[PDB]
Symmetry: C2
């Protein structure tokens, strides 16, 4: 009964749940990278935004932090800023956007990895990852994570090793 | 003069401009994919949100459209929704999030490509792409686009062919 089979097809919600959690995963990872980055030109910006700040500052405050660091902003800056995020900005997200992901160093990527690999055994397991993404976690929570890693779990072992995490971060 | 050289290093803004425009690029592309998708289970959701709607509806309205289509929402739906986007939602973004990008068909990807390849010669050129992303475009606009495609322009010819666009969309 094709009509019946279609009416009970749930793949749309599956895909969405996976996408949403993968997004959270990557944003958490980039928050750690942005914090640990040894690129001084990112660090000073981070420092400048923290002395204005929660994690949240107005876009006007972000522009000022940039300008006061010695940068000339392009005429369409505001339009570019809208693409990444009521006139306020998560500045760490800006900082993440300012880091070239294809050129991340192994050491910097490991700083992020280490945080998800809580027991430090070299594998981000479902329960470790669920912990990082949701930490009073439920059964349901752990299983949503287990489904989300399928795409980046290249060897099919149900865990994320460093190679897989790295691939995912360098977007390749 | 290392101190001087660092003070005039602009790479942070470069990376950000690239990231922001690449994000716009991908979101436009997914808007077209979501609109043309032959997956009926996406189409009906699209139809249900349009009869509630701008492109914008409340998250409560999104939940209702889902529920009224026959779906049971998970207990943490609201938390998952926050990851993708004052209580309102761009529902096309939801629809995009519900599509598995690794499994996009060649025909569906081409529907998006065709829109950026305005002259239909099989190449998305800088000026074509700038047109799609910004269409009274300036000189500056065209050049920001030219810098942004470097990462997905695999053969270095300054244009995006279908293979490169496809790779970019399927996130691989
Ligand atoms: Ca571990
Ligand atoms: Ca694995
Ligand atoms: Ca063309
Ligand atoms: Ca090319």
């Amino acid at each position: 009964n094709l009509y019946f089979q279609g009416k009970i097809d749930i793949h749309v919600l599956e895909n969405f749940k996976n996408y949403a959690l993968m997004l959270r995963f990557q944003k958490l990872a980039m928050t750690i990278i942005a914090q640990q980055s040894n690129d001084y030109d990112v660090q000073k910006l981070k420092a400048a935004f923290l002395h204005l700040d929660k994690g949240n500052i107005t876009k006007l405050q972000l522009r000022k932090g940039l300008e006061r660091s010695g940068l000339m902003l392009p005429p369409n800056f505001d339009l570019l800023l809208d693409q990444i995020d009521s006139g306020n900005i998560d500045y760490t997200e800006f900082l993440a956007a300012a880091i070239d992901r294809r050129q991340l160093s192994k050491k910097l990527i490991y700083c992020a990895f280490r945080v998800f690999d809580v027991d430090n055994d070299g594998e981000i397991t479902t329960a470790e990852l669920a912990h990082v993404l949701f930490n009073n976690i439920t059964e349901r929570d752990v299983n949503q994570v287990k489904k989300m890693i399928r795409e980046v779990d290249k060897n099919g072992d149900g865990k994320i090793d460093f190679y897989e995490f790295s691939e995912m971060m360098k977007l390749t």
